[PDB]
Curated annotation (Swiss-Prot):
Active-site residues per Swiss-Prot or TrEMBL entry: H15, D33, C104
Subunit structure: Homodimer.
Protein name, UniProt field: Protease 2A
Transmembrane segments: none
Summary of the function given for this chain in its UniProt record: Cysteine protease that cleaves viral polyprotein and specific host proteins. It is responsible for the autocatalytic cleavage between the P1 and P2 regions, which is the first cleavage occurring in the polyprotein. Also cleaves the host translation initiation factor EIF4G1, in order to shut down the capped cellular mRNA translation. Inhibits the host nucleus-cytoplasm protein and RNA trafficking by cleaving host members of the nuclear pores. Counteracts stress granule formation probably by antagonizing its assembly or promoting its dissassembly.
List of residues binding Zn(2+) 1: C50, C52, C110, H112
Catalytic activity: Selective cleavage of Tyr-|-Gly bond in the picornavirus polyprotein
């Protein structure tokens, strides 16, 4: 579990969004596993606007932050789960690292701010949903 809090927006994994997130929906994309809802209180996270390929992510199943190298956001096949059928997820970045069910939502950060959140895992790989292209998160 986990979310990004920037301005009056809350960014969560779409498959973990609550019924209340849907009532307060701003934008969602099933193909990216992302959902953004509106908030009343202003948040303090800064979104990275860069092409960094190295950063640090939080792994809740280890209670540890790990430094990683990660691939550029791309269209990657994700096996069927209880949340989605087998499909290509877009804007996904992979790193060699640990992730297990329950780790989604952990933040991936570089020197510029938040890059994305954990969205996939298994087989010694961890996948992050990129948020750096969502320029509108920085306004209104
Ligand atoms: C590490 C982790 O999150 N997982 C994992 C790991 C090891 C074995 C199985 C899993 C399931 C789960 C995972 O990858 N997803 C289930 C939730 C939705 C995700 C998506 N973006 O489509 C896919
Ligand atoms: Zn960066």
């Amino acid at each position: 579990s986990g979310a990004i809090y920037v301005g009056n927006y809350r960014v969560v994994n779409r498959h973990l969004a609550t019924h209340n997130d849907w009532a307060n929906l701003v934008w969602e994309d099933s193909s990216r596993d992302l959902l953004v809802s509106s908030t009343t209180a202003q948040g303090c996270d800064t979104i990275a606007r860069c092409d960094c390929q190295t950063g640090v992510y939080y792994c809740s199943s280890r209670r540890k932050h790990y430094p990683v190298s990660f691939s550029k956001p791309s269209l990657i096949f994700v096996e069927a789960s209880e949340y989605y059928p087998a499909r290509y997820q877009s804007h996904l970045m992979l790193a060699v690292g640990h992730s297990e069910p329950g780790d989604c939502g952990g933040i991936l950060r570089c020197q510029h701010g938040v890059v994305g959140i954990v969205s996939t895992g298994g087989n010694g790989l961890v996948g992050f949903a990129d948020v750096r292209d969502l320029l509108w998160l920085d306004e209104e």
